[PDB]
């Protein structure tokens, strides 16, 4: 079991350089039975292999990108990294790091462990953290014994925000909607959870809103009105 941790999402300006780092835990990056690579997925599209590195520094690049990409490795800190020069909006995508094993006989490579993915947005606008508003339950949001509550996450840039409830302890009944692009060029989304209306006098429900591009987290206790 490996865990691969990428640096978080953010903005990169047109024509500047995207830079990402993956930290490997659960095993050494100095392994003669692994390479280490980067893959990306444009929003709504499929997957493209960017390139790979062996723990000695040898590198392998997709020729659709070989001019602009550099991958490097730091065995001392169990890290490897990716630089992508002169970016455009064609480079906006979720970038994944991955360990690359293979199945003998032959070098039948596979991607067996993956990072969580980091969304990179190429854009001229600046970042804006979100404003968070409660969507509050009452008798008027109670279907028999089940109430809906949520929070409205308004006016942020770039994507993504992630939302959890009660620090991730509450997961079933949660729906976090895809963000919408508003005419101001800022995003909004909402996240809701359904809970027994009899619990609203007793249990605390807190929506946890994380906006890594602005290094902001917002926690909002959502109360019946």
């Amino acid at each position: 079991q490996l865990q691969l941790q990428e640096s978080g999402p953010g903005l990169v300006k047109p024509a500047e350089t995207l830079s990402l780092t993956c930290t490997v835990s659960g095993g050494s990056i100095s392994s003669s039975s692994y390479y280490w690579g980067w893959i990306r997925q444009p929003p709504g599209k499929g997957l493209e292999w960017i390139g790979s590195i062996y723990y000695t520094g040898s590198t392998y690049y997709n020729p659709s990108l070989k001019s602009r990409v550099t991958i490097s490795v730091d065995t001392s800190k169990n890290q490897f990294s990716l630089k992508l020069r002169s970016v455009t909006a064609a480079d906006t995508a979720v970038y994944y790091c991955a360990s690359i094993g293979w199945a003998v006989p032959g070098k039948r490579y596979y991607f067996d462990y993956w990072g969580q993915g980091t969304l990179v947005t190429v854009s001229s606008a600046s970042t804006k953290g979100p404003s968070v508003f409660p969507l509050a339950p009452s008798s008027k949001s109670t279907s028999g014994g089940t109430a809906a509550l949520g929070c409205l996450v308004k006016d942020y840039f770039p994507e993504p925000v992630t939302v959890s409830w009660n620090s991730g302890a509450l997961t079933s009944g949660v729906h976090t909607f895809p963000a919408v692009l508003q005419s101001s060029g800022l995003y909004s989304l909402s996240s809701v959870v359904t809970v027994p209306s009899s619990s609203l006098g007793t249990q605390t429900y807190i929506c946890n809103v994380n906006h890594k591009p602005s290094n902001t987290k917002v926690d909002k206790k959502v109360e019946p009105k």
Partner: peptide, 12 residues
């Protein structure tokens, strides 16, 4: 669907 409608918060 279960349908629910939320008015604006006084905060907003």
């Amino acid at each position: 669907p279960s349908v629910f409608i939320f008015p604006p918060s006084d905060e907003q």
